[PDB]
Amino acid sequence: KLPPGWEKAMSRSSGRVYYFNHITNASQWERPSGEPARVRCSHLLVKHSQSRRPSSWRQEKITRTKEEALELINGYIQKIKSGEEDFESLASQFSDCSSAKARGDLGAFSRGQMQKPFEDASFALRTGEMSGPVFTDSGIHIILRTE
Numbered sequence: 001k002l003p004p005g006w007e008k009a010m011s012r013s014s015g016r017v018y019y020f021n022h023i024t025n026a027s028q029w030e031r032p033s034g035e036p037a038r039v040r041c042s043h044l045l046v047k048h049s050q051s052r053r054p055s056s057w058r059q060e061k062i063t064r065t066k067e068e069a070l071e072l073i074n075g076y077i078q079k080i081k082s083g084e085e086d087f088e089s090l091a092s093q094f095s096d097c098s099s100a101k102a103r104g105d106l107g108a109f110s111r112g113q114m115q116k117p118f119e120d121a122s123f124a125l126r127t128g129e130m131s132g133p134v135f136t137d138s139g140i141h142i143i144l145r146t147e
């Protein structure tokens, strides 16, 4: 039927079908379009108090809860999707990863390099697509596949 990970769902508020991807946590109204050895991704990480390393270049001790991090991630996605703000503008300013200085770019990578939830989301994204919140031991990511 649909590309890897995609499924139909019903909107609770509107009643229109939409599409949801249980690997990338992407969701969208439109039916998804149509694996490589490597992909290239950028990401925006929001760390929290249960992150493996509760520290980042933004904050020496990161104290926010997982739920507060998820709300930050959700707001960033809203601003990206609405075009009020660009993915790399937000990554540069707010990602708790050192790759913020590279606009969130992590470069090319193969399978078996990144943490598994990140890897799987990255390889299920089509070029140009963005994930929803992706949970790993580092925190919560928004992932943009650039190549």
Ligand SMILES: OCc1ccc2nc[nH]c2c1
Binding pocket: 045, 096, 097, 098, 113, 114, 115, 116, 118, 136, 138
């Ligand atoms: O493997 C997933 C992943 C990727 C990039 C990261 N930067 C900080 N923590 C990270 C975790």
Ligand SMILES: [Cl-]
Binding pocket: 052, 053, 138
């Ligand atoms: Cl880390």
